[PDB]
């Protein structure tokens, strides 16, 4: 029983997340990330690591994706198509909806850098994703004969989920980006007491007060009539800010305008309003009254940088030269024409990823025997590992990129038990006694069977040992037997509450009866029969009696 783990990328850093695991000889692909700035074609993992060339589907039979963020699914197109892969791929449906346009936009941005010589293509992305199989939340799909995949809600972004891998008694959980702290439009990650063998997590790192400050600043600007935009590329944070601003304006009842420019925002809004169940409970409940993603604070034409400023809230998504970059030229140029990004400027960015306290809460909840740390700063994961060691004394790991981690595991043996034996065992336990075990090797399985039930195999020739205990005393038999019975029932703490008609007392499964000798009248001998488990106890008790008695 061995567990093989060797993640590459993001083990001691951020980006290029790729965790390869072969839990029971079944290779599982948990993530395929990237990291921008690698102009030397280091963005993707090393496909040659599996084997120099060849069919990936031969080696891999399962692929998993966390969420639509490029650091979790950026290298999927080239890895799946260019290297050559047509095997099963499992990921959540909203991620399948959000992913393709993001990948295509990133591919176009790479084309703008003229580094598209050995890069993706739109057609192969469409072909690969059309072949990808979706998955629902908590869908315990059996992807193989022994391997199953179960997803759990993460809440980092819409469609983000964490996967529980189980085969036999083995258990592996990989989460990627999550957060205990709930978002303004998403729910917190939840999982039962899965208690898996291993856990893979991220180590990267006054929310309502920050929201109040942001809303107050925006309200002050619009009341003053100033125009301020929020250049942000993240879709989840943009949608959260849009929802927050929309509900804030609706609560204030004022009719100030607010719009969003890029059509990708409109596509994201369409996907968000389609996928209601992957959002906060207020969204789900308010859906009964009316759709909340739809509001008078709608889309932006802006007369193509000719509609003038005003009490306006606008969103732009450049990138780095994409989108309507002329917005800066039309605006700015004076203190009143403020432009705030993460006349003044403040950090309105919201930490989608949770802090170390969230990771502590998750590990305390699940309580795995081993943990694995990836996708974060080296200092952060070292400090978090030291804190885990200090607080819980639970084994952990700090694998570097490409570091091979092996974990021992205990494979429980599944067998069946006869109903009568279990009933007797439960009755004995309800009101010290230990249960025997007798099993027969079966065709691809093992079964336990009781001694009486085992006799049905007929043949069954039963042999029983009967040792003789010899004592030398002039006292009579029956009175000595009564004295022995009294002494035993006093020593055994009243564990004997049964009797036999022929003056015999039995404890557990040993019979004590008075029997005359064979031929010799001058010596008295009795016969006692027992099994080995009873034989050891009987020998110990006889030795204790022979050690000393009132004789």
């Amino acid at each position: 029983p061995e567990i093989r783990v060797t993640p590459l990328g993001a083990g001691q850093d951020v980006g290029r997340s790729c965790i390869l695991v072969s839990i029971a000889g079944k290779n599982v692909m948990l993530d395929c990330g990237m990291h921008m700035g690698f102009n030397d074609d280091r963005r993707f993992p090393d496909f040659s690591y599996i084997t120099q060339n060849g069919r990936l589907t031969d080696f891999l039979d399962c692929v998993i994706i966390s969420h639509f963020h490029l650091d979790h699914c950026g290298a999927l197109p080239y890895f799946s198509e260019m290297v050559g892969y047509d095997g099963p791929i499992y990921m959540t449906h909203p991620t399948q909806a959000i992913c393709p346009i993001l990948l295509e936009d990133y591919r176009k941005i790479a084309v703008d850098k003229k580094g598209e010589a050995n890069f993706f293509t739109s057609q192969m992305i469409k072909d690969c994703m059309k072949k990808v199989v979706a998955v629902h939340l908590h869908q315990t799909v059996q992807v193989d004969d022994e391997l199953e995949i179960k997803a759990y809600y993460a809440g980092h972004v819409l469609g983000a989920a964490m996967f529980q891998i189980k085969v036999g008694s083995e258990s592996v959980v990989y989460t990627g980006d999550y957060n205990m702290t709930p978002d303004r439009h998403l729910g917190a990650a939840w999982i039962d007491k899965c208690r898996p063998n291993l856990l893979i997590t991220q180590s990267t790192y006054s929310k309502r007060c920050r929201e109040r400050d942001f809303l107050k600043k925006v309200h002050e600007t619009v009341e003053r009539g100033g125009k301020v935009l929020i250049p942000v590329f993240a879709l989840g944070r943009a949608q959260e800010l849009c929802i927050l601003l929309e509900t804030f304006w609706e609560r204030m009842n004022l009719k100030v305008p607010i719009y969003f420019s890029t059509g990708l925002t409109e596509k994201a809004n369409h996907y968000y309003k389609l996928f209601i169940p992957w959002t906060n409970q207020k969204i789900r409940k308010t859906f009964v009254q009316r759709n909340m993603f739809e509001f008078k604070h709608i889309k932006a034409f802006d007369r193509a940088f000719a509609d003038n400023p005003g009490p306006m809230v606008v969103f732009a998504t450049p990138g780095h030269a994409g989108q309507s970059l002329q917005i800066f030229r039309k605006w700015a140029g004076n203190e009143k024409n403020m432009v705030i990004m993460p006349m003044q400027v403040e950090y309105m960015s919201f930490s989608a990823h949770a802090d170390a306290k969230g990771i502590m809460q998750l590990v305390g909840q699940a309580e795995p025997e081993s943990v694995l740390l990836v996708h974060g700063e080296a200092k952060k994961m070292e400090f978090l590992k030291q804190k885990i060691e200090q607080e819980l004394r639970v084994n952990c790991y700090m694998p570097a990129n490409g570091e091979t981690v092996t974990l021992p595991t205990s494979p429980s043996i599944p067998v069946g038990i006869s109903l009568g034996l279990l009933k007797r065992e439960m009755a004995q336990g309800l009101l010290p006694r230990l249960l025997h075990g007798t099993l027969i090797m079966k065709e691809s399985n093992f079964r336990l069977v009781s001694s009486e039930q085992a006799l049905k195999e007929l043949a069954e020739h039963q042999l029983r040992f009967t040792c003789r205990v010899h004592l030398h005393d002039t006292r009579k038999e029956q009175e000595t037997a009564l004295r022995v019975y009294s002494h035993l029932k006093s020593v055994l703490k009243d564990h004997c509450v049964q009797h036999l008609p022929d003056g015999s007392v039995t404890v557990e499964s040993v019979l004590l009866q008075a029997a005359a000798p064979s031929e010799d009248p001058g010596t008295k001998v009795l016969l006692v029969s027992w099994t080995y488990q009873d034989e050891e106890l009987g020998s110990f008790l006889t030795s204790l009696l022979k050690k000393g008695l009132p004789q």
Binding site: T6, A24, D46, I50, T51, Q52, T404
Partner: protein
């Protein structure tokens, strides 16, 4: 023993391997060796 035979059966359930784990010494693996 029964455990020994059972582990042999479990180990007998084997498939392909990766060249990089075979080549891995000190556990850490090399990616893009040409670079």
């Amino acid at each position: 023993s029964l455990w020994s035979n059972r582990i042999n059966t479990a180990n007998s359930r084997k498939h392909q391997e990766f060249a990089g784990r075979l080549n891995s010494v000190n556990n850490r693996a090399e990616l893009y060796q040409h670079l």
